[PDB]
Amino acid sequence: ADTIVAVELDTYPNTDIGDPSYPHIGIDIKSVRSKKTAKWNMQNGKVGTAHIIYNSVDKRLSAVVSYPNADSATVSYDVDLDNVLPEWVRVGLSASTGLYKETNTILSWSFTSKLKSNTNALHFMFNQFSKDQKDLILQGDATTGTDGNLELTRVSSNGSPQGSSVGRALFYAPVHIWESSAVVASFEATFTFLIKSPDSHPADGIAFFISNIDSSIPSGSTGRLLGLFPDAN
Amino acid sequence: ADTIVAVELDTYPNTDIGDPSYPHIGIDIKSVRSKKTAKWNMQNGKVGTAHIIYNSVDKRLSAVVSYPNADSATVSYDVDLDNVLPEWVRVGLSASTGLYKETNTILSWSFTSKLKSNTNALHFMFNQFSKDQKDLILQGDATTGTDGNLELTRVSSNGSPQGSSVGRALFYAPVHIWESSAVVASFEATFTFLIKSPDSHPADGIAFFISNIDSSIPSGSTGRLLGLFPDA
Amino acid sequence: DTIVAVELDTYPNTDIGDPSYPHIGIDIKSVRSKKTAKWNMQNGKVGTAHIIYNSVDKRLSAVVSYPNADSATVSYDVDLDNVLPEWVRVGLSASTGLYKETNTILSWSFTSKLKSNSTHETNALHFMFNQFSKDQKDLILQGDATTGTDGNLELTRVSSNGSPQGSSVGRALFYAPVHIWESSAVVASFEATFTFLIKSPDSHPADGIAFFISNIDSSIPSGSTGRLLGLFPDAN
Amino acid sequence: ADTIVAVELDTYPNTDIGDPSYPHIGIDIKSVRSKKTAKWNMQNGKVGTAHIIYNSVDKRLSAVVSYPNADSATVSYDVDLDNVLPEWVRVGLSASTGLYKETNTILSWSFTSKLKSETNALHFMFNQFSKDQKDLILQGDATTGTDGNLELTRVSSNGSPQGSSVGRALFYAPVHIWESSAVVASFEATFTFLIKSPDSHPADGIAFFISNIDSSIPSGSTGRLLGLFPDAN
Numbered sequence: 052a053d054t055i056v057a058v059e060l061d062t063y064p065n066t067d068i069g070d071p072s073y074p075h076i077g078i079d080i081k082s083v084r085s086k087k088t089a090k091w092n093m094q095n096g097k098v099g100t101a102h103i104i105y106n107s108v109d110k111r112l113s114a115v116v117s118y119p120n121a122d123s124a125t126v127s128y129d130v131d132l133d134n135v136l137p138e139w140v141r142v143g144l145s146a147s148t149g150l151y152k153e154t155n156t157i158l159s160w161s162f163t164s165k166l167k168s169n170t171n172a173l174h175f176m177f178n179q180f181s182k183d184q185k186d187l188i189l190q191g192d193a194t195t196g197t198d199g200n201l202e203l204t205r206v207s208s209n210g211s212p213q214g215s216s217v218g219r220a221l222f223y224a225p226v227h228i229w230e231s232s233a234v235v236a237s238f239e240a241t242f243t244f245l246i247k248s249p250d251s252h253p254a255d256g257i258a259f260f261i262s263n264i265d266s267s268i269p270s271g272s273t274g275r276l277l278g279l280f281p282d283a284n
Numbered sequence: 285a286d287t288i289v290a291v292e293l294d295t296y297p298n299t300d301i302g303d304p305s306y307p308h309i310g311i312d313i314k315s316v317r318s319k320k321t322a323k324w325n326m327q328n329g330k331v332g333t334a335h336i337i338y339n340s341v342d343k344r345l346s347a348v349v350s351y352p353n354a355d356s357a358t359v360s361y362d363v364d365l366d367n368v369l370p371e372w373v374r375v376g377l378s379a380s381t382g383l384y385k386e387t388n389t390i391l392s393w394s395f396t397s398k399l400k401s402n403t404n405a406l407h408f409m410f411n412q413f414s415k416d417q418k419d420l421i422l423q424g425d426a427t428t429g430t431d432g433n434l435e436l437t438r439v440s441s442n443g444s445p446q447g448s449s450v451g452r453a454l455f456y457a458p459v460h461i462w463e464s465s466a467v468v469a470s471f472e473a474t475f476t477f478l479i480k481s482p483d484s485h486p487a488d489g490i491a492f493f494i495s496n497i498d499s500s501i502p503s504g505s506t507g508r509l510l511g512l513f514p515d516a
Numbered sequence: 517d518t519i520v521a522v523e524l525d526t527y528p529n530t531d532i533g534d535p536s537y538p539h540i541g542i543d544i545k546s547v548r549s550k551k552t553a554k555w556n557m558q559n560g561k562v563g564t565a566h567i568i569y570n571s572v573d574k575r576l577s578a579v580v581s582y583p584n585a586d587s588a589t590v591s592y593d594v595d596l597d598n599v600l601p602e603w604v605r606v607g608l609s610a611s612t613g614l615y616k617e618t619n620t621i622l623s624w625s626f627t628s629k630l631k632s633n634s635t636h637e638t639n640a641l642h643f644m645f646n647q648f649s650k651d652q653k654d655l656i657l658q659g660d661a662t663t664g665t666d667g668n669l670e671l672t673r674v675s676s677n678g679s680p681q682g683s684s685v686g687r688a689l690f691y692a693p694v695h696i697w698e699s700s701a702v703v704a705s706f707e708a709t710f711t712f713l714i715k716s717p718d719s720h721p722a723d724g725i726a727f728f729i730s731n732i733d734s735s736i737p738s739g740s741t742g743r744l745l746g747l748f749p750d751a752n
Numbered sequence: 753a754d755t756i757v758a759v760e761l762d763t764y765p766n767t768d769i770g771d772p773s774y775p776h777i778g779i780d781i782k783s784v785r786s787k788k789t790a791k792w793n794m795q796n797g798k799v800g801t802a803h804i805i806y807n808s809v810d811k812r813l814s815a816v817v818s819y820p821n822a823d824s825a826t827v828s829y830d831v832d833l834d835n836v837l838p839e840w841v842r843v844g845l846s847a848s849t850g851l852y853k854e855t856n857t858i859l860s861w862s863f864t865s866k867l868k869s870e871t872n873a874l875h876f877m878f879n880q881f882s883k884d885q886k887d888l889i890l891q892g893d894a895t896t897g898t899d900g901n902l903e904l905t906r907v908s909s910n911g912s913p914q915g916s917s918v919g920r921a922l923f924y925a926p927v928h929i930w931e932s933s934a935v936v937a938s939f940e941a942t943f944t945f946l947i948k949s950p951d952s953h954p955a956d957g958i959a960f961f962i963s964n965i966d967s968s969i970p971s972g973s974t975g976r977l978l979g980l981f982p983d984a985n
C-alpha cells in the first residue's frame with residue numbers, strides 16, 4: 052500500500068487501537084498505533100499551531116502543538132527516515148470524522164526541505180488558499196476558497212461539520228526528502244488549525260504526513276485512521 | 285498556441301527574424317522578435333549567470349547576464365504581465381541548436397515567487413540535478429544525470445554538442461504569478477550556464493520562460509525559435 | 517549626514533511643499549518629497565508599508581495598503597550609489613507637533629542582498645520582528661521610542677491612558693550596519709515591510725511615520741519634531 | 753569571565769587538558785575540556801565546511817565537518833542553552849596558534865536564528881569579506897582582505913602563518929538566542945575554512961562560538977584555548 056510517516060493531532064481516544072485515554076499528539080511510522088504520544092490539552096474553537104522538524108544528523112522527528120498562552124505539548128521519536136520513506140515523497144495534511152465530528156480547518160501551511168550534497172531547497176508557504184489552488188492536490192472531501200482557508204473535512208454552508216468524512220491536501224511538487232550522497236538534510240513544517248465542535252466529543256483529528264508520490268486516501272480510512280491507513284495494525 | 289514570456293540568451297544572430305548583428309540578451313513577449321535587446325559579450329567555455337526579476341509595483345521585467353570579472357549586459361522592458369500571462373503558470377529553461385551547435389549546460393537554477401493578498405510564496409533552488417529529478421518536467425532532448433548538471437540540448441558521450449536539438453525543463457509545481465486581489469507580487473529567477481562550442485559559430489541559445497501550465501515544445505522549434513515558439 | 521526615506525505623511529504642511537491631503541512620499545536628502553501620491557489614511561486601522569529597490573532598475577518604490585482598500589503607490593528613479601554611503605543603518609522614524617497620533621509599529625522586516633562581480637556568491641542580511649520585547653538589544657531606540665507595550669514598538673510618546681502626545685520625536689534603527697551598495701556588485705536589492713496602527717482622537721492626526729536609510733552614526737536632528745518626522749534639521 | 757558555548761575544530765592534540773590523541777571536533781560548554789568529541793580527518797590545504805545546529809525542542813547542539821568526497825565527522829551533545837547562555841548573545845568565529853602554526857582562513861559564514869512566541873528571525877550570509885566589514889567586530893589579529901576572506905590568525909606577506917596568534921570575528925548585532933515565552937527557537941551556523949600548514953604538526957584550531965554580548969579575547973588565550981577561555985579548567 053502507501054508508505055506513511057505522520058504527526059497525528061488525535062482529538063478522539065480510540066483505546067481499542069492503542070490511543071491513550073485523552074486527546075494526544077503522536078508520531079505514526081507505517082501505522083496509526085503511534086510510536087510515541089503525549090497528552091495534548093486541545094482547545095475547542097481556538098486557533099492552534101503545529102511545528103514539525105527533522106534532520107539527517109540527529110535523525111529525530113519532533114513535533115510541538117501550542118495554543119497562544121498555554122503550555123505546548125511535545126513529542127519526539129528517533130527514526131532514520133532513509134530506512135522508512137522513499138527517496139522522493141509528497142507532503143500533505145489529512146483529517147477525518149466518524150460517529151463524532153469536528154471542523155478540520157487549516158488557516159496556513161509552510162514547509163521547507165534542504166539537502167546539501169557530498170544545497171538544493173524547496174519552500175512553500177500558504178496563508179491564503181484560493182477557490183482553485185493549482186499547487187495543491189485535494190483528495191476526499193477537501194476544499195479551498197471558503198474564507199481563504201483549506202477545509203480538510205466536509206463542512207455544510209452554515210459552518211456545521213459532517214460525520215464519516217476523510218480529506219487531504221498534498222503539495223503538487225514531489226520533494227527530495229533524503230539522498231545517499233547527502234551531508235545534511237533538514238525539513239520543517241508549520242500549520243495553523245481551528246478545530247470547532249458542537250459536541251463534548253470532538254473527533255477524530257488532523258495529521259501532517261509524508262507519503263510515496265502517488266499516495267491516495269485508503270479505503271474506509273474515515274474516523275480513527277485519519278485518512279492515512281487502510282487497517283488499524 | 286502556448287503563451288510564452290521569456291528572457292532569451294541568443295548566441296546566434298538570425299537578422300532575418302529581427303535579431304541584432306551580434307550575440308544578444310532579449311525580452312520576448314508572445315514572440316521570438318524581442319521587445320528589447322542588448323549586446324551580450326558571450327564567452328565560449330566560461331560559466332555565466334542570469335538574473336531575472338519583476339514586481340507588480342514597477343511592472344518591469346529586467347535581466348542581467350554576467351561573467352565573473354567582465355561587464356554585465358542588462359535588458360529591461362515595461363510590461364503588465366496581468367495582461368499577458370495566465371494567473372497560473374509554469375517556469376522553465378529552454379535551449380536549442382540548428383546548423384550550428386553549442387552545449388546548453390545549466391549548473392544551477394533558483395526561483396522565488398511572492399504574492400501578498402488583500403504572503404504566499406514558492407522557492408526552489410537546484411545546485412545539483414540527480415539522474416531522476418522528479419520535481420522537473422524534462423521535454424525534448426533534456427537530461428539531468430550528466431555530472432550533477434541539467435544538459436538542455438543533446439551532447440554525445442565525448443562531450444561534443446549535437447545539431448537540430450530542442451530541450452526544456454519546467455518546475456513540476458504550477459506557480460501563482462499574479463492575482464486580482466493582490467497588493468504586491470514579485471518573482472526572481474537565477475541560473476548558471478556553461479556554453480561551449482568547437483566552432484567560431486555557436487548556436488542557438490538558452491531562455492528562462494514562463495508559460496501556460498500545459499506548455500510543450502512547439503513543432504520544429506529547433507534553432508532560432510529556442511524551443512519556445514511555433515513561427516516567427 | 518544623509519537621509520533617504522519613504523514618508524507616510526498624515527499632516528499636510530503646504531508651506532514646505534506637502535500636498536493638500538495626507539500623502540506617501542519619497543524624500544532624498546530633504547522633507548520636500550521628490551514624488552508623492554494621495555494616501556487614504558484610515559484612523560485606527562492597521563496598514564502595511566512595502567518598500568523595494570534594486571541596482572538594475574535603480575528605482576525606489578513604496579506601496580501602502582489597508583485591508584480591502586486600494587493601495588497608494590509612489591516610485592522615484594534614483595541611483596542610491598550617488599546618494600547613500602556604501603555602509604548605512606535602517607530605521608523607522610515618527611513625530612507629532614500641534615496635532616498628535618499613535619505611531620505604533622506592530623512588525624518590521626528588512627532584506628538586503630549583494631551579488632558580487634569578483635566572486636559568484638551573495639552577501640545577505642535579513643531581520644524580521646513580529647514581537648518587540650522590553651529590552652530589544654538588536655534595536656537602537658532614539659527619542660521617545662519604546663518597546664514592550666503589547667509587544668509593539670511605540671515610536672512617539674503615548675501616556676498611561678493610551679493617549680498619544682504632541683511635540684514627540686522617536687526612531688528605531690537596526691543595530692547592525694547594512695552594506696547597501698558595492699562598486700564590484702552585479703545586483704543589489706533591498707526590501708522593507710512594516711505594519712503600523714495610527715490612531716488619533718482629533719479630526720487632525722499628525723505628523724507621520726517614515727522608513728529611512730541613513731549614515732551609521734545618525735541621530736535625531738534638533739527640533740525635528742512635527743513636520744520634519746525626526747529626519748531633517750531644517751525644511752529645505 | 754565571558755560565558756562561552758562553542759564547537760571547536762581542534763587540530764592539535766593537547767592530551768594534558770583532555771584532548772584526544774588525534775585532531776578532533778568537539779562541543780565545549782563553559783570550558784575547553786569538550787563535553788563530547790569525535791575523530792576528525794583534517795585535510796591540510798583542502799577547503800572544509802562546518803554545519804552547526806540546535807533547537808529548543810530536542811535541546812541538542814550538533815555539528816558536522818566534511819570535505820568534498822570524504823566521510824563527514826559528527827559530534828552531538830544534549831544541553832538546555834536556557835540554563836547556560838544569557839537570553840541575548842553575540843555569535844563569532846575564533847582561531848589561534850602557539851608553538852605550532854596553521855592558516856585559519858574563513859571563506860564564508862552563514863547564521864540563522866528563529867524564535868516563535870509571529871516569529872522573530874535574524875539571518876546573515878558572508879561569501880565575500882571587504883577591507884572594512886562594518887557588520888563584523890574583529891578582535892585580536894583578525895583581518896578582512898581584498899582576497900575576500902576573513903583571516904582569523906596573523907599571516908605574513910609570504911602567505912605564511914604565524915605562531916602565538918589569537919583572533920575573533922563577532923557579528924555586530926546581538927542575537928536573541930532564547931526566550932521564556934517561546935514555543936520554538938532554532939539556530940544554524942555554516943562556515944567554510946581552509947587550514948594550510950608547512951609542518952606535520954598544524955595548530956591549534958578554529959571555533960564557532962556564542963558568548964555574552966560584551967565578550968573580548970581572554971588573557972593568554974593563545975594556543976590550546978583557541979582564544980575562547982582564560983584558564984584550561
Ligand SMILES: CO[C@H]1O[C@H](CO)[C@@H](O)[C@H](O)[C@@H]1O
Nearest residue numbers: 148149150151254255274275
Ligand atoms: C465509536 O467509534 C466511531 O466513532 C469514532 C469517533 O469519530 C471514530 O473515530 C471511529 O472510527 C468510529 O467511527
Ligand SMILES: CO[C@H]1O[C@H](CO)[C@@H](O)[C@H](O)[C@@H]1O
Nearest residue numbers: 381382383384487488507508
Ligand atoms: C542557417 O540557420 C540555421 O541554423 C541556425 C544555427 O542554429 C539556426 O539558428 C536557424 O534556425 C537555422 O536552423
Ligand SMILES: CO[C@H]1O[C@H](CO)[C@@H](O)[C@H](O)[C@@H]1O
Nearest residue numbers: 612613614615722723742743
Ligand atoms: C501648525 O503646524 C504645527 O503642528 C503640525 C502638526 O504636527 C506640525 O507638523 C508642525 O511642525 C507644527 O508644530
Ligand SMILES: CO[C@H]1O[C@H](CO)[C@@H](O)[C@H](O)[C@@H]1O
Nearest residue numbers: 849850851852955956975976
Ligand atoms: C606546548 O604547546 C604549545 O604549543 C601548542 C601548539 O600550538 C599550543 O597549543 C599550546 O598552547 C602551547 O603554546
Ligand SMILES: [Ca+2]
Nearest residue numbers: 061063064065
Ligand atoms: Ca484517535
Ligand SMILES: [Ca+2]
Nearest residue numbers: 294296298508
Ligand atoms: Ca537567434
Ligand SMILES: [Ca+2]
Nearest residue numbers: 525527529743
Ligand atoms: Ca507633513
Ligand SMILES: [Ca+2]
Nearest residue numbers: 762764766976
Ligand atoms: Ca587542542
Ligand SMILES: [Mn+2]
Nearest residue numbers: 059061070077
Ligand atoms: Mn492516535
Ligand SMILES: [Mn+2]
Nearest residue numbers: 294303310318
Ligand atoms: Mn533574438
Ligand SMILES: [Mn+2]
Nearest residue numbers: 523525534541
Ligand atoms: Mn511630506
Ligand SMILES: [Mn+2]
Nearest residue numbers: 762771778786
Ligand atoms: Mn579539544
